Amino acid sequence: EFPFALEVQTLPQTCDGPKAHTSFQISLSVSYIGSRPASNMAIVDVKMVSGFIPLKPTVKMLERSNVSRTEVSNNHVLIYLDKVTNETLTLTFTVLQDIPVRDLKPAIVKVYDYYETDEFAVAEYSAPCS
Amino acid sequence: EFPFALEVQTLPQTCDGPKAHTSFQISLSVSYIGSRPASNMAIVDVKMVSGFIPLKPTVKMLERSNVSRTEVSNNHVLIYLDKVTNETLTLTFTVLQDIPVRDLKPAIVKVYDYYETDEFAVAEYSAPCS
């Protein structure tokens, strides 16, 4: 059982051209559906597809939201959500191909409450030209 | 006084804390109150407060209603309505502070008929912490 609804899409969704190989946006949607009225502070952890890096200003721009901190470390983007309720929060940022890698595999995204254990969900996404 | 009724408010309405400095919602309401039964195609044109930009997905979200399309362009948000009648349409979207600018002055919102140059309204709004 997952007390968060988590889904991830890319923009573009398909390998629709040369540009889709070297850059795409990641678009995450999250809400809280568990036993409590709402989450506490929560973290969304996005792992990068192999060879991809996040574009810093589009990560920092998420802080303008209902997000109070972000971090880029070790090929992960961390997003600190203030509070998650039954309303869907959508977050979008850009990634860039730093190193082309063959055989691109899916990357996992996790969301978890910062303070209560076993309040988490997982999902995955792929580069559009995988 | 205009053949359109046009009102604009921001969420939050005042500078209620740190987050009000860096993002807010723009909420506008419009109806046609003129001689004619309804307006033709009308355009709503929202100019950004200095330093702010729209959160594009919340603009694109408007596109389902009397709303035939939206555009983000040269730091205006443009909303195309197929027709406007006496019933009030409310449209709400998010803007984000990209760069902090000193001394924020009010920004203009317009609605006008695609054909009748005499049929327009104007209203002002300010960033909550301007």
Ligand SMILES: *[C@@H]1O[C@H](CO)[C@@H](O[C@@H]2O[C@H](CO)[C@@H](O)[C@H](O)[C@H]2NC(C)=O)[C@H](O)[C@H]1NC(C)=O
């Ligand atoms: C971040 O969360 C806030 C909640 O505080 C959202 O603000 C609400 O937005 C809706 C929809 O436009 C309004 O109907 C509510 O009145 C707002 N409430 C407040 C307290 O402002 C906001 O939409 C969220 N920002 C996102 C989703 O990016």
Ligand SMILES: [Ca+2]
């Ligand atoms: Ca649990």
